[PDB]
Design a protein around this nucleic acid. Structure first.
Length: 48
RNA sequence: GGCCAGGUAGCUCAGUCGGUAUGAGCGUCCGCCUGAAAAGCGGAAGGUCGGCGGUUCGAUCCCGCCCCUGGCC
C-alpha cells in the first residue's frame, strides 16, 4: 500500500505550493487539472 | 392522486443499486501537416451524474422531501 502519511503529505505540500505560485486564473486551471483532476497524484491514491 | 420509469459533457444519448462516468458520437484546444485550412494521425481540456438534506472515513448508485418530462388517469 502506497498511502503512507508522508506520501499524501508529499502530494499536498506540492499541490499547495503550485496553487500558491498560480498567479493567473488560467494557470490555476492547469494546476487544478494536475493536482485535483481525475489524473492527479491524489486521484491515483483515491482510486486505490 | 398511485407504484413506477426518466433528468448524466457544449449538442444527442449510453452506462454503473459506495472509493476510475478509463463514457460514446459530434462540439472545443495543441502538435505533425498546409501559403492558410480541413480530413487523417498523434496528444489533451471540460461533468461538482436534478436540487436541499440524511447515512457513511468516503455517495451519480442506499433513506426522506421537493423541483420538471412522460406513461396511465
Amino acid at each position: 500500500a502506497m498511502l503512507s502519511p508522508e506520501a499524501l503529505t508529499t502530494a499536498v505540500d506540492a499541490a499547495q505550493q503550485a496553487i500558491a505560485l498560480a498567479d493567473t486564473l488560467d494557470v490555476l486551471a492547469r494546476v487544478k487539472t494536475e493536482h485535483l483532476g481525475d489524473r492527479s497524484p491524489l486521484a491515483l491514491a483515491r482510486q486505490a
